Paper text:
Pseudomonas aeruginosa CtpA is a carboxyl-terminal processing protease that partners with the outer membrane lipoprotein LbcA to degrade at least five cell wall-associated proteins, four of which are cell wall hydrolases. Instead, it requires the adaptor protein LbcA, the lipoprotein-binding partner of CtpA, for activity in vivo and in vitro. Therefore, it appears that LbcA interacts with CtpA to assemble an active proteolytic complex, which controls the activity of these enzymes by degrading them. We show that CtpA alone assembles as an inactive trimer of dimers and that LbcA is a right-handed spiral that might wrap around a substrate protein.
We then produced selenomethionine-substituted CtpA crystals for single-wavelength anomalous diffraction (SAD)-based phasing. The derivatized crystals diffracted to 3.3 Å, leading to successful structural solution. There are two CtpA molecules in one asymmetric unit (ASU), and CtpA formed a hexamer that comprised a trimer of dimers in crystal. As expected, each CtpA protomer consists of an N-terminal dimerization region (NDR), a PDZ domain, a cap domain, a protease core domain, and a C-terminal dimerization region (CDR). The PDZ domain is partially disordered, but we generated a homolog PDZ model based on the CtpB structure and accurately docked the domain guided by two anomalous density peaks from selenomethionine residues 153 and 160 of the domain. The CtpA catalytic Ser-302 is located at the end of the narrow tunnel between the cap and the body region. The PDZ domain is in a position that blocks the narrow substrate peptide tunnel leading to Ser-302. Furthermore, the catalytic triad Ser-302–Lys-327–Gln-331 is well beyond hydrogen-bonding distance: Ser-302 and Lys-327 are 4.2 Å apart, and Lys-327 and Gln-331 are 9.1 Å apart. By superimposing the two proteases, we found that transition to the active form requires the CtpA cap domain to clamp down toward the catalytic site by 11 Å and also a large-scale movement of the associated PDZ domain by 12 Å. However, the six unhinged CDRs of three CtpA dimers interact to form the triangular trimer-of-dimer complex.
Numbering used by the authors:
A (entry chain B), C (entry chain B), E (entry chain B): 41 to 87, 191 to 377, 411 to 434
B (entry chain A), D (entry chain A), F (entry chain A): 41 to 87, 191 to 376, 411 to 435
Write the structure that this text describes.
Amino acid sequence: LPLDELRTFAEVLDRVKAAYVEPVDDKTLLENAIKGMLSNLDPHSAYVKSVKSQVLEPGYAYLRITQFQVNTGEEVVKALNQLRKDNKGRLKGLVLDLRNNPGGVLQSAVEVADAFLTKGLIVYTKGRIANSELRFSADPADPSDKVPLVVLINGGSASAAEIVAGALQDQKRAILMGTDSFGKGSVQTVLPLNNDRALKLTTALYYTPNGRSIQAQGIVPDIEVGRAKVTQERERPQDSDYQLSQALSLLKGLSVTR
Amino acid sequence: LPLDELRTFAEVLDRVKAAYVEPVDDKTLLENAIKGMLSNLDPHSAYVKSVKSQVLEPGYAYLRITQFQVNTGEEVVKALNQLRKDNKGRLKGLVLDLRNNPGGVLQSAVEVADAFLTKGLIVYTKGRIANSELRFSADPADPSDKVPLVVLINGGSASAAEIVAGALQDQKRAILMGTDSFGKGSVQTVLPLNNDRALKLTTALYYTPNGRSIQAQGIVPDIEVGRAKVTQEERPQDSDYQLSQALSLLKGLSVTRG
Amino acid sequence: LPLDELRTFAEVLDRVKAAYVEPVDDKTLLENAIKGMLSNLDPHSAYVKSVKSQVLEPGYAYLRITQFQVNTGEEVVKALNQLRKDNKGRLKGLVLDLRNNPGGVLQSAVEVADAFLTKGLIVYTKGRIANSELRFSADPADPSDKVPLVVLINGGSASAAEIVAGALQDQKRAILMGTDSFGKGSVQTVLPLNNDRALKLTTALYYTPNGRSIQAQGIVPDIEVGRAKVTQERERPQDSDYQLSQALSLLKGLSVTR
Amino acid sequence: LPLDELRTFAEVLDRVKAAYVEPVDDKTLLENAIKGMLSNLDPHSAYVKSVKSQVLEPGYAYLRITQFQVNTGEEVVKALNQLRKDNKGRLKGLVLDLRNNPGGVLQSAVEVADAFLTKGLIVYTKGRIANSELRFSADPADPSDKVPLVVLINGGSASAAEIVAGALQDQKRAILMGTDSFGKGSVQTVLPLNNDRALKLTTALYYTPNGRSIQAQGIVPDIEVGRAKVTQEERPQDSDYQLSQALSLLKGLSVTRG
Amino acid sequence: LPLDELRTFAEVLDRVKAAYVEPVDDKTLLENAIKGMLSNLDPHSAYVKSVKSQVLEPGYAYLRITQFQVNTGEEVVKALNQLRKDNKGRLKGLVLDLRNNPGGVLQSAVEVADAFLTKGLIVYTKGRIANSELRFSADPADPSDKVPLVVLINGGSASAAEIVAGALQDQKRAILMGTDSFGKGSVQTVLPLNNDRALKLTTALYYTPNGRSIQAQGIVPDIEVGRAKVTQERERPQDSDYQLSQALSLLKGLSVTR
Amino acid sequence: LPLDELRTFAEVLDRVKAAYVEPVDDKTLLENAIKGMLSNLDPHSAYVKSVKSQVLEPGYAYLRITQFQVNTGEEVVKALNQLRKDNKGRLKGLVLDLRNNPGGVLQSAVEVADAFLTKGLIVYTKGRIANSELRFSADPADPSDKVPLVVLINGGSASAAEIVAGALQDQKRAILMGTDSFGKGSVQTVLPLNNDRALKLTTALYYTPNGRSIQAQGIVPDIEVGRAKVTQEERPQDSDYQLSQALSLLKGLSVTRG
């Protein structure tokens, strides 16, 4: 209780209680002060097939994560094996379509990351409260079989998807190409109050294995690729998708070099 | 200041000070509570020749209010008589162009309304502060000489212009034509505080003679006519759809009224 | 017999009888003189569903007179009652489509006028001969039930239709909108001659109740509306017909005002 | 003047003077009878270097008659010999462009025709006045040197030009190609009257050597070829369809004639 | 054996035999010298329905020779009689489409020429060897019945077709219109050598009846007609074919003149 | 000179001298035999700042060889160090633009190759003349500092440029990207003859370190990327498709190589 600043606050509240057009009691003024304190502090504060896979070309395959549901992990691994069986042999290249992904279940995101990682950190949450600081390490099993993969990120790629992309980039496991990411990397917990109502507050934020806050930076692709049309001067989706075609050609060139 | 609910607000503020990710001191939380109490209460709260006239057709004339300045009233009357001299006789119809009129001097607004009204109320403010409750009644002189007129109002006409239009409509003096209006009919007083800072608070709001709040209702035209451009296959009605509609309505009204 | 001017005429006729390329007797020269005297004097001198009605919108109906036949009168009244039954109630507005109407039976025109008029003059013929000066007065029965109506006139609106429109305008019963009218308001009677052939001559002309000659003035609409296209900047025929849509909107505004 | 039928005409004129709507005196009726007797009898009755030549191709030349002036004849002959000098030898074919030729001096027309004819009639007028009947016979000199020629005639070629074309066609001297002609082949003499006013009357009309009246028949080309523009994928045949057709016809005619 | 020039040749051959990158024996050098001597001397040296006829318009018919096969002659005569039977009477005009004709059997070409010629030379071959100088004269039978015909030649008209066109032009029997011809008018005979291989050499060239070498001049049409589009300013193939339409109109005009 | 086969060649030449249509003397036949022996044997036989560099992105640079002049080598090295100074550190990737490079000084070519190679062969010529067989081995200094580079080759890159590219490819030093090359890898020496005239003969041809003849094989890029223009919806990769592909390949290669 600062009391002096509380005196200033109560004086402003009394002036409003006296002058406003429609009469307002103390309770509604207090509630509006609370709601606006939260709105001014933090915007997030208050008071269906998941996975689709396809072998786009012989040796090169495409895996898209529409959303992060609970089944998503098992489904991505199922898709990995399915693509390996479709190519009738080991894969030369893979594309992770994580663009247009709002986010979803954090555990499902971490297991999707685990399908590509054999060791190291994946994501860790930092905040100032007893049970916020969390960490997630990769298990020594990757169903990807070390396949070279390029991850696609758009503006509409946030939360869980951003975590996956960041983990894949910091482990130097994937090539991120596309535009920048949303940058939504904060966790909201509902805290209880003595009065019979509770408040939702961002209590911590996500951090990639390197240590860069997802919320501030976002995820910057290693190669920036905006939408564009190519003009020659000399199913199959890449004929219509610019970013997918670019990722495919990059994987092709990488395979040829390697 | 009821301390008992102050307990609830302090408890909530302390819980927020404890849980948020990046630490914030008591001062910023109190200041944000103030700013949001005002913001959540009221969005407006914080902490060129005026008239141009023309006789469109023999018997039918057009009066435009670009803005509400002090001269406006005199000029409007100067225009009225002038149009009577232009037609060399009494007018069969008149069009009040109040579209694209943000507002202006309130006294000029009541003067413009009073040039058409011989009795009754024009506009009245209701509020809870000591010296806000005021009223405006028409004087028994109308330089309009009882001419039938159509008033045109669009979205970009607010405050004073809405006061004029509402007065003309509720007094059954004019027929309003066009789209709905802005609906800005509130007065903000700057109130001083013990500390060397002040708060802007709406202290009263305007009401049309019927009793309809301009701020909530707005002024709804009797005839809805959206903006359009006509192309034949100076004379502004030949190019302006809304003005042409009002002119033709006045002509037909005059013919029936024989 | 002027005889001196007859001498001049006969001298010219003899010169022509002598000089022309192909020989011509006195009779053909006389006949050509007659035919050209008539052509030079007056151009008119010498020597199928009628009615369609529809309720275009709830409360507002449209009645078109393609042509003036004998049945036309009964048909317009039949249509009036039919439109009243279609709306399941009294009508708010009516449109008389008299455009593209060459004319027709005068009595049918006067009865069509009688469906809207309860008293007063309708049309009167004036000429200089025993039985030309005629008058037509409205009977005290109007099946229109005083419905407000707008009449549409084009360039191709003449004779009977022009009479109807003029009567409706001079009685201040309808609003005439559109372009100007044809202006054909003369009656041709065949007169008998001593020789076994007869001549058709305009013997009189029509006059509206006010007294304006239909032949000279034509019918000027109270509102002039040429064909045009409207461009918004925000069956059902009026969506395609400009004049009909204008008449509909005028009737709508009149109903709202009234 | 046979008074017995003058009775009929006077009776008719008096009946007209009696019946017409607006009164007209005897003088205007008599004057209109005169004007219409002439108008109904005959529509024409009431009360720049001339030649340019060029050799289109080796052996084939083009002679254009813009208008029929006095110099035209001499110039045409001057052109003929000149073309012979241009080709350095006798011509294989010649094109007479008589299109867009209103007419002109009749003597120049018979001269132009005579430059191609060695015997026979050229044109003769028939009428009933004393000194109109004239004839024109060709002199036994043709500077054309018997060259085969095609004459081009369109609608805008009348009188003198038609006289030339008709003479050339009926004498089987030229092949006419194009559309039909105007057909204006009549001569108007101004005749004086006892009163100080005169009348224009056609006193005779032209006839081609066959005997066909130019005024009624016109001159119909042996080959119909409408106007057109050709675009390859100076030389006027490269741009003019009718001239190109005539040139190709002359070339083929020359080849067959070997 | 010049021997001195043979010494120069053998010295050059020895220099090449010594210096070239890949070793070459005397035989391959000799063979290359031979092949290049032939290539440098003369390019031609080394070391399915035929006829379609149709009556395009009443009186005017069209005969196209796609190629010169053995049956071609009988087929053209068969077509002549067929067209005569189709028109149910003698023909007014005929078009020989010889354009886009590489050539073919010389005897078939000469018989096709014989279908139009009653006497005179058709084509003769000139060269310097015992049995090269040949001549071909027309037999006194022409199934064409002297019908006037126009022959069409394009750039792709060579050898046999060029011979036919040239014969028809030099006899002044047909009108050749179109663009210039290919100009391929040489005969290649294979000559035997002591060694077990032989050489093909142009031994003579064709000449038209006039004496102009087909190989050098080509066949120049009497009327030049490139592809073009006509624009009026006023099955049936000529509506789509410019050259065919021109030939048709020329035949029409020729028939009218004759 | 083996006279026995000289018999065959003389016999053939005499038969040709006897059979050809227009007579040709022995001299022209011998001269043509010479010219064609050279022409049939070998088609080539008969009888501006060089380097421009730029750092495209932080860590990635671009070096263009317009032409191979004497300064080129020095300039290339001057450019290499300069780019190292521009990036203020070692480069992550480099692009060698050898497209549109006809060739130039061979020593400058081996210098340009030597700026990237520390050991091994660069290019060697094979022929049969005395002093053609030469070899070029790399010196143990590479100013490239082992930077990974992609070389771009199109069709319009020949000789020296192909030598550089082939050396870089066979030494597994660079990844070649683009279309195939011209393939002009032969050296022509002018040889003198006893008579005062000389012959141009290819005396040797180039070979890449692998042993592949540049003239026959050409240099085939490891990655095929045709020319195209990209349009976003200075920086040349933003406009050049092939350069952008090489840049993205280098970036991905650098990321994987961590």
